[PDB]
Amino acid sequence: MSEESQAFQRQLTALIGYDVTDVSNVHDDELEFTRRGLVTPRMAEVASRDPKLYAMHPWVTSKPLPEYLWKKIANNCIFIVIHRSTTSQTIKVSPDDTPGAILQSFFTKEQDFVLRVCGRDEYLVGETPIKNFQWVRHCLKNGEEIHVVLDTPPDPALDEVRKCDRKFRVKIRGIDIPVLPRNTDLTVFVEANIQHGQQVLCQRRTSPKPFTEEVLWNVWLEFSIKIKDLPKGALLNLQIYCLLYYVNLLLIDHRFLLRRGEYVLHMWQISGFNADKLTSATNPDKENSMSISILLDNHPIRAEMPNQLRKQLEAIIATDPLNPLTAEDKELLWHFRYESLKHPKAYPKLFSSVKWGQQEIVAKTYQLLARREVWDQSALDVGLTMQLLDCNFSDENVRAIAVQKLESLEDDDVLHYLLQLVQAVKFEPYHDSALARFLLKRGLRNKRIGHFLFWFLRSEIAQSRHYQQRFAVILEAYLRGCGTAMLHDFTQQVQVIEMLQKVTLDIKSLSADVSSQVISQLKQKLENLQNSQLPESFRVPYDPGLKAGALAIEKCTVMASKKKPLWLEFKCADPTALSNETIGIIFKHGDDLRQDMLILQILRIMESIWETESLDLCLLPYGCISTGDKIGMIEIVKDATTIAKIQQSTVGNTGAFKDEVLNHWLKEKSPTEEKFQAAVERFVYSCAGYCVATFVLGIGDRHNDNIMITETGNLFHIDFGERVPFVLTPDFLFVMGTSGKKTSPHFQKFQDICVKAYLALRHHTNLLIILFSMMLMTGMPQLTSKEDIEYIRDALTVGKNEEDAKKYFLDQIEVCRDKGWTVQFNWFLHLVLG
Numbered sequence: 001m002s003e004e005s006q007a008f009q010r011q012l013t014a015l016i017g018y019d020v021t022d023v024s025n026v027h028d029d030e031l032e033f034t035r036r037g038l039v040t041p042r043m044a045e046v047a048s049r050d051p052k053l054y055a056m057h058p059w060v061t062s063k064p065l066p067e068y069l070w071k072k073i074a075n076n077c078i079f080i081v082i083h084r085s086t087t088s089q090t091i092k093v094s095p096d097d098t099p100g101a102i103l104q105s106f107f108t109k110e111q112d113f114v115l116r117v118c119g120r121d122e123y124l125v126g127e128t129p130i131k132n133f134q135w136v137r138h139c140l141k142n143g144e145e146i147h148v149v150l151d152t153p154p155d156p157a158l159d160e161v162r163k164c165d166r167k168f169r170v171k172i173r174g175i176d177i178p179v180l181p182r183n184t185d186l187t188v189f190v191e192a193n194i195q196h197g198q199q200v201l202c203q204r205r206t207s208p209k210p211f212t213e214e215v216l217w218n219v220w221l222e223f224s225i226k227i228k229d230l231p232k233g234a235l236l237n238l239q240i241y242c243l244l245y246y247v248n249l250l251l252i253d254h255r256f257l258l259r260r261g262e263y264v265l266h267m268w269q270i271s272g273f274n275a276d277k278l279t280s281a282t283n284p285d286k287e288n289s290m291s292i293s294i295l296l297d298n299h300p301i302r303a304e305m306p307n308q309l310r311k312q313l314e315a316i317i318a319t320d321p322l323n324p325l326t327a328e329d330k331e332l333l334w335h336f337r338y339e340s341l342k343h344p345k346a347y348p349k350l351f352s353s354v355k356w357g358q359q360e361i362v363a364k365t366y367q368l369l370a371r372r373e374v375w376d377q378s379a380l381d382v383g384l385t386m387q388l389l390d391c392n393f394s395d396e397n398v399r400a401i402a403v404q405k406l407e408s409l410e411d412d413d414v415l416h417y418l419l420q421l422v423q424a425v426k427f428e429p430y431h432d433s434a435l436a437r438f439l440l441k442r443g444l445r446n447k448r449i450g451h452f453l454f455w456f457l458r459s460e461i462a463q464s465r466h467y468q469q470r471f472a473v474i475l476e477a478y479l480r481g482c483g484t485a486m487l488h489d490f491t492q493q494v495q496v497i498e499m500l501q502k503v504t505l506d507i508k509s510l511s512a513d514v515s516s517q518v519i520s521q522l523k524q525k526l527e528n529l530q531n532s533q534l535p536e537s538f539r540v541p542y543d544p545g546l547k548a549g550a551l552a553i554e555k556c557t558v559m560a561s562k563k564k565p566l567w568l569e570f571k572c573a574d575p576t577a578l579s580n581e582t583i584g585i586i587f588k589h590g591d592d593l594r595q596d597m598l599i600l601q602i603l604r605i606m607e608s609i610w611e612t613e614s615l616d617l618c619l620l621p622y623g624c625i626s627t628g629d630k631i632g633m634i635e636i637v638k639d640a641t642t643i644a645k646i647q648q649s650t651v652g653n654t655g656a657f658k659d660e661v662l663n664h665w666l667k668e669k670s671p672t673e674e675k676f677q678a679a680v681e682r683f684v685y686s687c688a689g690y691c692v693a694t695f696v697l698g699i700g701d702r703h704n705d706n707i708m709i710t711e712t713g714n715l716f717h718i719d720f721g722e723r724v725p726f727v728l729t730p731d732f733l734f735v736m737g738t739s740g741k742k743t744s745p746h747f748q749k750f751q752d753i754c755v756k757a758y759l760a761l762r763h764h765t766n767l768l769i770i771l772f773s774m775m776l777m778t779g780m781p782q783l784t785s786k787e788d789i790e791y792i793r794d795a796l797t798v799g800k801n802e803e804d805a806k807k808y809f810l811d812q813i814e815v816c817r818d819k820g821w822t823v824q825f826n827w828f829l830h831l832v833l834g
């Protein structure tokens with residue numbers, strides 16, 4: 001390649017955090033094949049994107065405007081403040097007025113201008129009703145004013161893109177590990193599993209042998225499955241037991257070819273189920289890791305139901321996603337497959353009833369799929385679609401009909417589910433997949449989706465040896481089409497994160513309570529960085545529309561919180577920014593912020609769900625991005641303190657919690673009596689939202705040091721990485737004006753809200769369960785494909801009328817009353833002292 005073409009790939013590499021041209025850790029060309037394969041989807045989408053829409057990235061939705069926002073518009077009038085220089089003129093508008101019209105009613109009171117939000121790279125442009133812009137909806141909910149500046153549209157030139165019937169068998173040669181302890185005397189054997197969507201088709205193990213650094217077997221393992229019966233995507237799973245090591249090899253390759261020949265596979269060690277176990281990547285660390293040597297030496301392609309069985313069938317289909325299928329259930333599902341195909345909700349269980357280890361059945365299964373009239377006309381059910389993209393499905397045709405459904409998601413909804421879509425790539429047998437191409441397409445079509453796609457990917461690439469390789473191929477494909485302007489923005493962001501992280505680690509390795517000394521070191525380090533050299537503005541990775549300028553080193557500090565987190569403040573790079581407020585970012589090692597990311601995203605989904613039912617529980621899912629191993633960034637919400645601090649103020653380092661302090665804190669913090677009363681109601685709304693959300697997720701029992709509140713009454717939980725269903729302590733209860741078995745107007749309001757909030761979530765039980773399940777598989781350590789997952793099943797009272805459920809939750813609230821400060825107090829003894 002050219003001297004400059006090389007220098008382009010180094011740039012990508014630095015952006016990616018991984019080198020997709022390195023081939024030290026492959027035994028085939030699937031990654032490189034995927035690179036070339038992804039060229040066609042990339043160019044297609046880049047070739048088909050409107051340059052101007054793309055450059056301006058309008059953030060819109062096609063959902064109805066919630067009942068709670070209509071009410072704020074009691075005139076069918078919407079005021080917009082337009083800004084030009086120092087001048088400023090407000091303009092009445094109809095909620096249905098497109099920006100081209102609003103412009104046109106304005107030059108009435110040279111037409112190549114565009115309405116941009118003040119202090120943001122956010123544009124109100126395009127043929128969408130003014131009421132259908134997310135920013136406009138955001139202002140309304142909060143009671144904030146829509147301020148827009150009239151300026152020139154961004155030049156799309158900046159967005160330039162750089163130009164057989166034999167039974168299967170496998171010979172296990174031996175295992176090799178360089179150094180083991182002396183020793184103790186252990187015994188070992190090799191387990192070989194033919195897997196498909198975590199379904200084991202057959203299993204053979206070798207005999208036991210004393211665990212030495214080299215163990216040779218030279219043995220053929222003969223399986224019962226015929227070569228012609230192997231399904232594409234089946235894994236050869238190789239495991240060592242004393243279980244200590246595992247590695248996987250795809251039996252059918254990306255070219256539909258039977259794997260053949262000599263392999264030396266460096267395995268992964270178990271630390272002390274999860275999607276890492278599924279990876280087709282081998283350990284990069286060839287010098288320390290256990291290695292296994294094997295050899296391969298073996299190419300592909302009615303009657304109406306009796307009333308009682310259908311009833312039996314329907315009772316099966318109506319059950320939840322975590323419900324086990326019996327042998328009888330699968331035989332029923334399958335025998336009556338044609339009837340089953342008419343029910344979209346049956347699809348996951350139906351496709352779990354497939355004998356994937358039998359070629360004729362799979363063939364019949366494909367026959368089923370060609371008559372997908374009922375599936376293709378059905379309304380998108382994201383919960384349902386997601387269930388087909390999890391670890392239970394390895395068949396690419398099955399996974400493809402799910403992705404097909406995702407095609408109709410609009411940007412607004414693709415964002416909601418993006419994080420978990422990206423995580424779902426881990427369940428893909430192959431690097432190139434429909435899901436992967438989908439993500440690729442949607443990122444290249446929309447800068448906001450693309451920005452978040454980038455950071456999500458880069459997050460896994462930086463802490464996942466198991467899947468970094470695959471993702472990097474995908475991230476590269478995206479960066480080769482997002483265009484020059486973004487490349488630069490990304491570069492800026494990456495430099496910033498890499499420099500601040502360096503500062504973060506360096507600061508932590510100085511102590512374990514507070515130090516005038518360490519604060520002084522921090523500011524000094526920041527002085528060196530600010531000049532020189534750190535990009536002179538950079539987009540905020542969790543709030544892309546926002547541009548951070550220069551540090552306000554005076555306001556920066558080291559928080560006395562544990563892992564010694566950096567509290568950072570920035571000026572806004574955009575001078576057209578109304579307020580004079582800084583941009584606050586916490587930078588912290590070492591929490592596994594991936595968990596925090598996932599909890600917060602599900603939180604945003606709960607918000608969206610509630611939105612469909614015209615509810616606003618006032619959640620505050622602040623931005624959070626895991627950038628690397630136990631390191632990442634967190635959005636600082638302005639004017640917010642922890643409930644714990646509120647209580648350490650009036651009393652010292654106790655303990656002796658008081659009921660009235662919180663209300664007291666709100667009145668002090670309220671300028672008028674009108675603002676106070678708004679804060680009191682907002683507290684009631686934000687409290688209820690978190691009580692419900694944390695309970696359904698099983699993270700309700702928290703110490704109040706992990707619960708915050710805004711000066712405006714917005715309660716919110718943080719740090720997601722006897723007992724209580726959630727935190728509803730006397731202080732919260734006092735604010736609503738009640739204490740100890742004494743209802744009240746604000747408290748009836750509270751209850752009533754929770755129930756509505758609760759029963760609404762239950763209408764989306766399956767979605768919540770699949771997202772939870774996946775979250776656990778791709779986001780938390782090894783788990784139990786049983787008990788962890790089942791908490792939420794119990795929490796959402798699966799299989800009960802709305803009446804029992806309402807009463808279930810009210811009961812949960814009563815548990816809180818009865819416990820009072822008992823549980824907080826306990827938390828205090830434990831976390832504060834021992």
Ligand SMILES: CC(C)(O)C1CCN(Cc2ccc3nc(-c4cnc(N)nc4)nc(N4CCOCC4)c3n2)CC1
Nearest residue numbers: 559560591596622634635636637640641642718719720
């Ligand atoms: C005592 C100090 C240093 O003078 C400050 C410390 C900051 N506190 C508030 C505070 C404390 C701990 C916090 N901890 C987190 C946090 C979140 N997730 C994880 N994993 N770890 C820590 N987030 C916070 N918020 C969140 C957004 O609002 C502002 C910061 C946060 N705020 C006020 C006085």
